[PDB]
Design a protein around this ligand. Sequence first.
Ligand SMILES: [Cl-]
Ligand SMILES: [Cl-]
Ligand SMILES: [Cl-]
Length: 221
Amino acid sequence: ELFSNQIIWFVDDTNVYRVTIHKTFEGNLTTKPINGAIFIFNPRTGQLFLKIIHTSVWAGQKRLGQLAKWKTAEEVAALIRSLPVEEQPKQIIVTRKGMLDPLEVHLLDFPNIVIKGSELQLPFQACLKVEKFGDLILKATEPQMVLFNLYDDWLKTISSYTAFSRLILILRALHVNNDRAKVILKPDKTTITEPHHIWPTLTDEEWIKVEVQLKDLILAD
Ligand SMILES: [Cl-]
Ligand SMILES: [Cl-]
Ligand SMILES: [Cl-]
């Protein structure tokens, strides 16, 4: 299913509409949008398209949570139209069921694309506390798209299946317990992440231990 000749994208809209809530000195709640992002992810290659959503897009509107699903569908269609046909996905898997109808309506010109939902736990929200992504999203002054390779150099020595599994454990562990996951991912004082990489440079033996520890952290919930 995943990892064949068919191009597959996971689409996560969870982080598109984001707000800060504050109790004022007068005792009322202010809710202020902050920048968000769409995550569009190819599990075979590790490609991430990060569409940064600047708060200016909300200017005027209400029911921003519902509108955000539609904005996401619009942006997915816009990305697809910007790609040659051979690079367009055959399947889009949405991580949240609320994306199904908006995407259906936005992709009527793409009869080859199959849209489905999922029960998979793929918390791209965890990327918001990976500084590379978090600061980039925070500080943006306009919408833009940024490409990343979420598998770093892993595919030189492991399969796409193994890479996908490693990434999911990382994201879920960061989601469940960011601070402990970050410790697990830094086994030595000298552990570094290369500037163009997302994740640490670890030996095969270190990854084995990390993967078990991340799994145990998720199990502990
Ligand atoms: Cl939903
Ligand atoms: Cl594979
Ligand atoms: Cl999770």
